[PDB]
Design a protein around this ligand. Structure first.
Ligand code: FMN
Ligand code: SF4
Ligand code: SF4
Ligand code: SF4
Ligand code: FES
Ligand code: FES
Ligand code: K
Lengths: 212, 43, 263, 429
């Protein structure tokens, strides 16, 4: 929903303030923009509150409005426009499965159902332990590595039902699995052998025209 | 000369504040910002 | 010397630079249809009802926002322009609720009237409609936001005229909603004017609700006495009873606004 | 020349595309980056704009405007406002992941491009807008920028050239529409990512209200190489007015989905077979290809037999090069469902600002969802065509066109499939 209703857990009196170290980070954010245009810092600072707090209560939105001297409504507009802001609490690991056509064509559905069975939840829900939250997202910009998921800040790619269940098993154990493809390649090169960039790259000055 | 290993592994150790810590680090390298002349459009 | 020559359906007109296409049409008595554009608010360009063909240009332009160029011929009645208006009106009405009998705007509704003059006469929308929850913004302005067409006039008026940044849009796409997000009352001495500028029945007067229809009201042009400004008003009456108070446009006094006490 | 493709590694620009060599400054310099940057800067903006002009480079962000002419809009006297370069790294087009490889594996190409391109425009700084999901890539870019600052390659007196230049990185927060140039500018300013009407154009009133040029990551990252090796060297690739090398993404029903650099105007068939290992199940198993990302209309196998991958060739095939993201669908695909999911994507991504896309795309999505099940009548096909034409060319920004076009491609080339599905539903009910 894109309207707010005060609750005991989410209301203007809910405690939130940036830590002393995050205030230092805020100063560097605000210094990135011309003077007289502090409102440009709304997105990075709002994201900073989420990284500290995990999600965005209304009191966190109010604090950002105060620090940057912007009307709170303009901050509410940003919080509700960009989908990476969590206006409700999310589990420790926010699993985000891409289901757009390129990933769908390479069986993102088998990934989605594998997660649902293993965690016993439905898309949109949080586990009772509050460790995992599962949602579908649009193209995450790793289409040649489909099917893939993002968990918090990391991408996990070239997934199969076995691979994702192994990633979730590692997460449940406190281990932090390595990101990237799980199929054998390292990034976006074709499997079965490079079809380009096999020879060593040229060095400084190669092919440089005259006059420089 | 090797072409069989991935040489982009540093990001396996990045954390929540990696990006903003680097932004804080770069703060001392920037030129002074321009000024619109007022504190904000509402001033 | 400064003026440039443009053409409205072949008729020459001389306009100052910066004049928009829509303003150039006013000069020859042609009123382009609009929803989001209000001459006392900042230009928005979002409703797209003002799309108009420029002769020899393949793409229709938003007349309310496009500055007119020298030698342009604005075709206000071409087939391209008419089809553009029909298409936009079709989208505006796709999710609009079948509320006219119970909606106070009925009879003086810019959506109704521009649908009558510039839209098609039937529907080909076969789906279900959007329904949006209502917002309480005080005892003066009733909200039925399923009627809102997202023109953002109320947002611009509040920010620019009233100097209150409490109205905005939340969400995205078809779910974009106008409101305050939190539960907040829009109590400003000029708040009641958003009833007038809202083109639809999304924002309506609470005291006036359900009491009258526009065609049956007699209009008496009068003056406000609630202060010393002398705001020009219209007193709507019916069968010997004062029904409501409306602003009367006077550029040198109140423009087209009145205070909530006057209203 | 009359045949294109088979680009040699000596002529490839992004030589660390696969990240098998050091992506940091030392590896970049060993590969030719940051070489004679001072000389290029001291040549002057008009010389730099001349080389980009002669190179025939066109925008790699999807619209393909000539880059040299576009960048020359900033080559004008100052008026007291600062000038900015905004590098578009939002990379949100479904099927497109090329810009991701440049940022994380060749970051110093992009940083040097910002300086060289910024110098041509006379900008004081560059803002690189990178989508918020590319966290690890943004951090990589941030590390490279710090190395450039420490080495004195950017910042005060960049490359000892007497020209100051800052490179800022700002992350998005989840919005495909923030890849649109003016929506990107609005997002940097702290507002909802809603596009601006034009005029004014960004070269007159852009970010913070100042003269601005928005350029795609790949467009920027290739400019330093064009200056070093010459525009003529770049124009010797691809057909006339389709110059240069191009990064391709081949995904979907291929054997080895991959990113690769190849000559412009390479045949689509040759690209899929040489680099992606061919269509899954053989070329005979091909059904349709989306050649330039979800915003470009699909083309059937018959068209894919001989078409060339460049702006002009794909326009004559009733589509476009777009981002050159090739999405391949074999004959086991439910083509109507594939397209219906793209319309669902555009429904989730529309900013909602303007009426035809706010309401039209959601309307198209509802109709397509029924077309998937066959729960419609054939008369609704011509209705859906007309609706898509009421969106196209009537919206503020090109997202509305980007949603209309995929629907048009489906109806143009697969009307029998849509009708067959309605016939099947009717007998079953
Ligand atoms: C909905 C939409 C999304 C877009 N996304 C991107 C993008 O992710 N990256 C990009 O470079 N251009 C994107 N564009 C194109 C930009 O608006 C603009 O044309 C481009 O940044 C100009 O740079 P170029 O000339 O170098 O291509 C998008 C356009 C639209 C309408
Ligand atoms: S706003 Fe106008 S069109 Fe809509 S229900 Fe009311 S009278 Fe009818
Ligand atoms: S409430 Fe009325 S004035 Fe405000 S955006 Fe909706 S239709 Fe426009
Ligand atoms: S076409 Fe869609 S995304 Fe573009 S401005 Fe209009 S509503 Fe927003
Ligand atoms: S379609 Fe899933 S990452 Fe692009
Ligand atoms: S009146 Fe011009 S777009 Fe709304
Ligand atoms: K009204």
């Amino acid at each position: 929903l894109f309207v707010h209703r005060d609750t005991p857990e989410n209301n203007p009196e809910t405690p939130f303030d940036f830590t002393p170290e995050n205030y230092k980070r805020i100063e560097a954010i605000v210094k990135n923009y011309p003077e007289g245009h502090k409102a440009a810092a709304v997105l990075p600072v709002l994201d900073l509150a989420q990284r500290q707090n995990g999600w965005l209560p209304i009191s966190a939105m109010n604090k950002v409005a105060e620090i940057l001297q912007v009307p709170p409504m303009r901050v509410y507009e940003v919080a509700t426009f960009y989908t990476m802001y969590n206006r409700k609490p999310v589990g420790k690991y926010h699993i985000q499965v891409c289901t757009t056509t390129p990933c769908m064509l390479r069986n993102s559905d088998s990934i989605l159902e594998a997660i649902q069975k293993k965690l016993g939840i439905k898309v949109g829900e949080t586990t009772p332990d509050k460790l995992f939250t599962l949602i579908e997202v649009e193209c995450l910009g790793a289409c040649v590595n489909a099917p893939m998921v993002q968990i918090n800040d990391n991408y996990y790619e070239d997934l199969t039902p076995k691979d994702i269940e192994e990633i979730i098993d590692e997460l449940k154990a406190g281990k932090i699995p390595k990101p990237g493809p799980r199929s054998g390649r390292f990034s976006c090169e074709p499997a079965g052998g490079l079809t380009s960039l096999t020879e060593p790259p040229k060095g400084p000055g190669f092919g440089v025209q005259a006059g420089l | 000369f090797d072409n069989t290993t991935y040489k982009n592994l540093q990001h396996h150790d990045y954390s929540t504040y990696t990006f903003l810590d680097l932004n804080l680090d770069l703060s001392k390298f920037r030129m002074p910002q321009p000024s619109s002349g007022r504190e904000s459009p509402r001033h | 010397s400064n003026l440039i020559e443009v053409f409205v359906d072949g008729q020459s007109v001389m306009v100052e630079p910066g004049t928009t296409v829509l303003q150039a049409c006013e000069k020859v008595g042609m009123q382009i249809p609009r929803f989001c554009y209000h001459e006392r608010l900042s230009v928005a360009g979002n409703c797209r009802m003002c799309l108009v063909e420029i002769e020899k240009a393949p793409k229709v332009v938003a007349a309310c926002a496009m500055p007119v160029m020298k030698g342009w011929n604005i075709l206000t009645n071409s087939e391209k322009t008419k089809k553009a208006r029909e298409g936009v009106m079709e989208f505006l009405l796709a999710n609009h609720p079948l509320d006219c009998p119970i909606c106070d705007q009925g009879g003086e509704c810019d959506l109704q009237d521009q649908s009558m003059m510039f839209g098609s006469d039937r529907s080909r929308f076969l789906e279900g409609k959007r329904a949006v929850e209502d917002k309480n913004i005080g005892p003066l302005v009733k909200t039925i936001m399923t009627r809102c067409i997202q023109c953002t006039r109320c947002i611009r008026f509040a920010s620019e005229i009233a100097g209150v940044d409490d109205l905005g849009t939340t969400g995205r796409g078809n779910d974009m909603q106008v409101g305050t997000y939190i539960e907040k009352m829009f109590m400003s001495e000029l708040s009641g004017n958003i009833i007038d500028i809202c083109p639809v029945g999304a924002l309506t007067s609470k005291p006036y609700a359900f009491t009258a229809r526009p065609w049956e009201t007699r209009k008496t042009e009068s003056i406000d006495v609630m202060d010393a400004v002398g705001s020009n008003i219209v007193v709507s009456t019916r069968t010997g009873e004062v029904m409501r108070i409306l602003p009367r446009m006077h550029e040198d006094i109140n423009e087209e606004w009145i205070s909530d006490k006057t209203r | 020349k009359t045949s294109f493709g088979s680009l040699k590694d000596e002529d490839r620009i992004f030589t660390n595309l696969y990240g098998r060599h050091d992506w940091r400054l030392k590896g970049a310099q060993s590969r030719g980056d940051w070489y004679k940057t001072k000389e290029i800067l001291l040549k002057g903006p008009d010389w730099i704009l001349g080389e980009v002009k002669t190179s025939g480079l066109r925008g790699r962000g999807g619209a393909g405007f000539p880059t040299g002419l576009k960048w020359s809009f900033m080559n004008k006297p100052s008026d007291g406002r600062p000038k900015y370069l905004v590098v578009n790294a939002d990379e949100g087009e479904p099927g497109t992941c090329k810009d991701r490889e440049i940022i994380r594996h060749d970051p110093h190409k992009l940083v040097e491009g910002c300086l060289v391109g910024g110098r041509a425009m006379g900008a004081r700084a560059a803002y690189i807008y990178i989508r918020g999901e590319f966290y690890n890539e943004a951090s990589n870019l941030q590390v490279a920028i710090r190395e450039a600052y420490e080495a004195g390659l950017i910042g005060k007196n960049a490359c000892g050239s007497g020209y100051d230049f800052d490179v800022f990185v700002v992350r998005g927060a989840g919005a495909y529409i923030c890849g649109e140039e003016t929506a990107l500018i609005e997002s940097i300013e702290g507002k909802q990512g809603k596009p601006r009407l034009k005029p004014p154009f960004p070269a007159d009133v852009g970010v913070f209200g100042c003269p601005t040029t928005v350029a795609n990551v790949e467009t920027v990252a290739v400019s330093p190489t064009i200056c070093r090796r010459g525009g003529a060297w770049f124009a010797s690739f691809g057909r006339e007015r389709n110059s240069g090398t191009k990064l391709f993404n081949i995904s979907g029903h291929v054997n080895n989905p991959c990113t690769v650099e190849e000559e412009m105007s390479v045949p689509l068939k040759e690209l899929i077979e040489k680099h992606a290992g061919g269509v899954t199940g053989g070329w005979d198993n091909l059904l349709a290809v989306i050649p330039g990302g979800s915003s470009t209309p699909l083309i059937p196998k018959s068209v894919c037999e001989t078409v060339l991958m460049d702006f002009d060739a794909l326009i004559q095939a009733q589509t476009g090069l777009g981002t050159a993201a090739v999405i391949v669908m074999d004959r086991s695909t439910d083509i109507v469902k594939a397209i219906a999911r793209l319309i669902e994507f555009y429904k989730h991504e529309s900013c909602g600002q303007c009426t035809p896309c706010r309401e039209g795309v959601d309307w198209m999505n509802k109709v397509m969802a029924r077309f998937v099940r066959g729960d419609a009548r054939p008369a609704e096909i011509d209705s859906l065509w007309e609706i898509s034409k009421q969106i196209e060319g009537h919206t503020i920004c090109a997202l509305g066109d980007g949603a209309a076009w995929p629907v048009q491609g489906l109806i143009r080339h697969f009307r029998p499939e849509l009708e067959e599905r309605m016939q099947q539903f009717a007998q079953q009910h």
